[PDB]
RNA sequence: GAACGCCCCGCCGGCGGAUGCCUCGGCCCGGGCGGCGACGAAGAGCGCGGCGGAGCGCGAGACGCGGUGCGGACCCGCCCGCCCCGAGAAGCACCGACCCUCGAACGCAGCGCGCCCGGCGCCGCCGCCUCGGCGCCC
């Protein structure tokens, strides 16, 4: 034995696998073109 | 003397908000009811109307959207719109959805950043996968 310390053994780790979906329907958000842009600002400076 | 001041013989004006009458409000008693939340509550922030400050309401589907019933001429301003044996304004009741940030508040922080390309908090119960021990044995 080379190291004098005891560390936790390496053990298998699993990936997730939910039995039902937590978001069954994919809904929209704030961002989409024509909603992210509101209007232009019209001045003589502009 | 006049005038100022004071009293009222009377006629008018101010300033102030008492009195009287009125009341979509309080207070007391009795009867019901006893119905929140990780399926994200109570509370807080911000935003939403054609002209839109406050409060009510609503959530980027925002001063509301749909479905079943009922109702049957209006919609406080300016406009729009509806109008008829159904074509459908006000209003009402139940039901289905949408539901931004913070909050028990859940990737870390509170407004800035990550690991990973589905996602990514803590405790507990029951199972399951993979494992440690010079514990008791073989
Ligand atoms: Mg949306
Ligand atoms: Mg307002
Ligand atoms: Mg959070």
TrEMBL record:
Domain of life: Eukaryota
Family stated for the protein in its record: Belongs to the universal ribosomal protein uL23 family.
UniProt protein name: Ribosomal protein L23A
Record organism: Giardia intestinalis (strain ATCC 50803 / WB clone C6)
